[PDB]
Symmetry: D2
Subunit: 275 residues, 4 copies
């Protein structure tokens, strides 16, 4: 239940979900290192997060392009060297550059998404895992997506790669349980971030998501932060290998239909293939 005097690494800690997770931990008295691509945002987030955690919290940043393994490895060394032990990780770094039919998918955009999500995650887990095993245990939380649990027509590499990441969390849980390192995935549904204010505020797509979602609201960053913190905590010490949706129940229905956005740009025939 407590996080005081524990140290965590948070990737994509500069905005959206990662920032919320970092906020939560620092406010609970944890030491956090946030890593991400943009030193501007990272620095900004740090001065802000520092206001929280008058409760013993601490915050640091290291700019890191997680598609380069050396940079990931260095960041993991630094967070571990901070107090000597790395208690956990929340991996929120990851992206999506594709939107369109599989038959016309931009292969460079696809390959970038694979590198970021699949390889990026592997580097973070590989190196974080080494220290958590040496430290006598810990908890790794991967942030996936409902795109992995429910097909999102025209999202190309997003759900494909997030499915890989979910499998990698389960594989690692299997391998690392003997070392008391728990590994779990969270798949958020529609969460309100500045990143996705186009969708959340659009009449057609907000309406489609709402019809797919049993609970009558959209998600919030705090919803995902709460699950991550629970899974990092000792209250989940027998929970590993799980893949858990924080999505208002959307996985019980279907992924969203982005027709209304895409039909005027691609035409209906392209959306069922047909080049």
């Amino acid at each position: 239940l407590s996080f005081q005097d524990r140290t965590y690494l948070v990737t994509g800690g500069g905005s959206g979900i990662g920032k919320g997770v970092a906020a939560g931990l620092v406010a609970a008295g944890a030491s956090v290192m946030i890593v991400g691509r943009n030193p501007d945002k990272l620095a900004g987030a740090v001065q802000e997060l520092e206001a929280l955690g008058a409760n013993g919290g601490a915050i640091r940043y290291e700019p890191t392009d997680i598609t380069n393994e050396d940079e990931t490895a260095r960041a993991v060394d630094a967070v571990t060297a901070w107090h000597g032990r790395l208690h956990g990780v929340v991996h929120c770094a990851g992206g999506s550059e594709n939107i369109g039919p599989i038959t016309q998918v931009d292969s460079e955009a696809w390959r970038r998404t694979v590198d970021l999500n699949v390889n990026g995650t592997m580097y973070v887990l590989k190196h974080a895992a080494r220290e958590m095993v040496r430290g006598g245990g810990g908890s790794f939380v991967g942030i996936s997506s409902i795109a992995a649990s429910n097909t999102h027509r025209w999202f190309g590499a997003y759900g494909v790669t997030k499915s890989a990441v979910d499998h990698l969390m389960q594989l690692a849980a299997d391998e690392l349980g003997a070392s008391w390192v728990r590994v779990n995935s969270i798949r958020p549904g529609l969460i309100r971030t500045d990143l996705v204010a186009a969708i959340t505020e659009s009449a057609e797509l907000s309406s489609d998501y709402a019809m797919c979602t049993p609970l009558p609201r959209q998600g919030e960053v705090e919803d995902v932060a709460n699950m991550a913190m629970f899974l990092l905590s000792d209250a989940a010490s027998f929970v590993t290998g799980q893949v858990i949706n924080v999505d208002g129940g959307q996985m019980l229905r279907r992924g969203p239909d982005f027709s209304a956005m895409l039909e005027p740009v691609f035409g209906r025939d392209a959306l069922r293939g047909l080049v």
Copy 2:
């Protein structure tokens, strides 16, 4: 978020249910435990009263969940206690026989079905009515790893718990519009009185440990922690989930009770020969 709230816990007289009740009482909640054995329910109350005051309170009503009318009466009693029912943790259920599918004791199978499938439906049906009228709540059904991974020779148990998990998800679909969340927890091997048979066997104990990534057995607190989280406002966007608390055993397989069952049935019987 437990302090000013009231919860129903079925099967609250021992094991998982009792742990859940104890955690909620400790947090300041009011809890009504119900179950078949009045001696055990009354004893659990006396024990849990010791968890005293964050202002928590505990009551019991003997209830046979195979009887819909008694179940509805229990739901009326918990609801009238402070005027609103905030959540349910449904731990009542079990099974009565290990053996090959070809030798299933049909009356025991029917009993397990009645208890697990029908009993869960009645609790859900009437708890949902009140949680809808009251403006929302959280229903947690306790299932088992027997539903997620085949347990050879467990017959009705895994079958009925899979039915229950589907019910939890169907109910989440139907009830989300009324702010009633419904989730399932599947425990792995949890240390209780009900598990002394696995405990006394080197073969069975070893088999579970080999099937379990984390190098320990589960505790009732582990399941109680998950249940409380899912009841809390910290899980307010979580519904329709089926979540294992099992040390990662679902990543491997169900246990193999061959060592125990071979001397009773014979090897041929365990692959269906009569």
Copy 3:
């Protein structure tokens, strides 16, 4: 691989069961159809006899699968016909009521449970006994997309069919050592007499089509084709599978019967208000 073999088909008097029976007869198999309605079973026999000779043959026995003794008697009859039972396609089952979980007709729910959970177990239990003694076989259980994707307001149907799918997998685990394969098929919307309500509604018909990647409704032949493949030696390394034949509807969602149910129950009732 059907020519010199004998199969039991439950619910063989109409719909999916009858299609399955017809395909097997056409291929030269002997088929016993069983079911509750003797007029319909007898009429199906007369029809299927027309499928004549690749040397195929068809018989019927009226059987109430909620009675284990009648079920065992049907399994004895099919087995004694040519001395070995090679497989089963279990299509008998159904449901009796659409409505919110908060207004479930408990007697109809129990009936659906008895028919689907208990009835399937009896057929499986006794068919498995003979298929084990005979040196192997293939058991195909027919389930439904209601088990793979929540169908709001379908109550016991999806719940019980999920129980059935778990049973198929448990039985595959137990019985593989005796070369008895057990698999489940989940059909989507299939064109039969049982679906005229969806057919007559623009709203419901449109909703299914929107939920279905392939731009057509399912046919009984589609399900019969899958069943035959799974019975065949071409599927000899396939067991424990649960396979949809649904035009890809499982990739989207279950149907939304709101248009039909709103005028009966009201909108508030459909989210659990009583």
Copy 4:
């Protein structure tokens, strides 16, 4: 039920499963193009496959490195131009170069596996799909693995990438159903090929697989070929988006434990992380 006068593309058609699938189709009277990396094997397989299909069958090859999209696109043009229509695809090309703990995984080997399985599959599906949509429909069958359905400790990228591929088949099925293009995945268990005679014939690993497998035998290439042919055929014309194991029921138990092979090479501590 028939395959006469239909044309199919088979990737990895030069050995193992692909060769068996190609054999099956040609023998049933189909035209097949087999593609793969090694022109020696491809040519060999063609002269052999030509003996079969006195029943109207036809066989061709094009050497193709499926990690290069241009080469994949050319092969798809050629098979389609052959008779004017491409009726289906069975995608068996794919590999696995990793064996060891996630904490010590060779990142170059990992990245190669991702490129082959994830990107390779996408290229094949993208371009094959274009023609099948234009042709009025068809059937794409992806060959995955039980490594995707059940965690295989120490298999690193194999199950991770095969999980991605399964998701991609489901996404494509969702997108392309409107065009009558069905897309499905097969996950084989232990299949006897020359590739894996080390495992299938080893006492410890054969024994472990056998205990995990309800049916008392190992798989055969014909078992997978039969499922693929059924899914290509009109007898499966309402079957799309499915992910189907041909594994003797192994998915009901667990993936294999390669401890006996790996412990003497890595030590027990490395196998639970600990570098």
